[PDB]
Amino acid sequence: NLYFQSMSVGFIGAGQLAFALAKGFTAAGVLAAHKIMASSPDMDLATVSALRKMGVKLTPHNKETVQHSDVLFLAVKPHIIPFILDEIGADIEDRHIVVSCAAGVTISSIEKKLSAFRPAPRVIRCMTNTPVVVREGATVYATGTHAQVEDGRLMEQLLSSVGFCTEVEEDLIDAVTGLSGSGPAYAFTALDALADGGVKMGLPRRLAVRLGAQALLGAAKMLLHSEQHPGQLKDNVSSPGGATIHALHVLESGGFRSLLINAVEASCIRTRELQSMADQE
Template identity: 90%
Template sequence: KKLSTFCPTPKVIRCMTNTPVIVREGATVYATGTHADVEDGKLLEQLMTSVGFCTEVEEDLIDAVTGLSGSGPAYAFTALDALADGGVKMGLPRRLAVRLGAQALLGAAKMLLESEQHPGQLKDNVCSPGGATIHALHFLESGGFRSLLINAVEASCIRTRELQHLADQEKISPAAIKKTLLDKVKLESPSLSMASASKVSLFTNKS
């Protein structure tokens, strides 16, 4: 909508990708604007498919995608770091613990994508009756593991919408909003900058 003020018929395609595009395993979605045609979408999809998975979605789903696959690599890295810590706690060398944890996540993801089975079924296949895995899963469930992940996706999605709202109000990007606030604090005298500094702290801590 903003671009239409500068160009009456802008060909705009909005997309959301993630950092694994660096290793050609990214997840990208896109939504075509009013004036972008099918061929424009196909061109972008062809480009982004070369660095991972890419598909078209309705634009109102992109914020949810941001919460899931956009922020998803950070969730995976955090989980992997914790798994490695668990391995180290139980006596494994750090390098080996990280490698085994990463391979477990990679293998699980590949099994899911290639088998197209429900993740719950694949999980059940690992759990022997009365075995170590089901005991470990019970411990995760008692700690609210699923709820934490669901809430994380929701929190990222909500924050994305908040940043977009700020951008719409300021008519600039979220990154520019942050820079403007920081510059304002630098220019003010120390006695006057405390309030602005606290606002910047609150803003940056929630990003």
């Protein structure tokens, strides 16, 4: 609905997240690759080589990225953000929307640094995940103190092109990190294990990987397109005395559900802990 074929996007950081978003945005056709600039500390990653081939402009100077861009994604380690903010703070102009993707880093900490330079920085905090690279990401965002109303709409329009996107209150983002931020790693672990189980029972490894991934994708899509509770879908597919209900019993006996709860909790708690350590420093 918004015309942003003239919009320039910059990434500070040229790692996994910058590649994933840039590949997703250009695959969606919402951004031309030549309108994307990325800056990296080391021009020796495979990520910067793939970005170069996409047509993304690459530079070693964070200041160049700032001057080129309208929307500026900060995709660096959480503990690097306060060094980037001190570096680029004077170059932030009124046109800029600063989008922080660093886990744990609060809007208040970013606005505090940038406000020392120019008084009303437009800041958005987001938590996205690597599946944006195949345009099936899960993203949430929260708008900062000086973010205008169209800033949030622009950001939802941009991130919706590469997956699910919705606005949340900032105090939910650490929990989202433990669920959909870390979620793909839980799935990769599960898929590796499911493939081992297929191999134990006689399947070739390549087929077992394909079938397990297709099973997970189809089940996830079923749930997304259904109004039904996941327990109801579980109920619908477990015939009496059959193979599936026998397998569900052995999952329950090992406390499978509790492990996944433990995981979301552990990732969320670590996210809160990393930020608390940063605020102390």
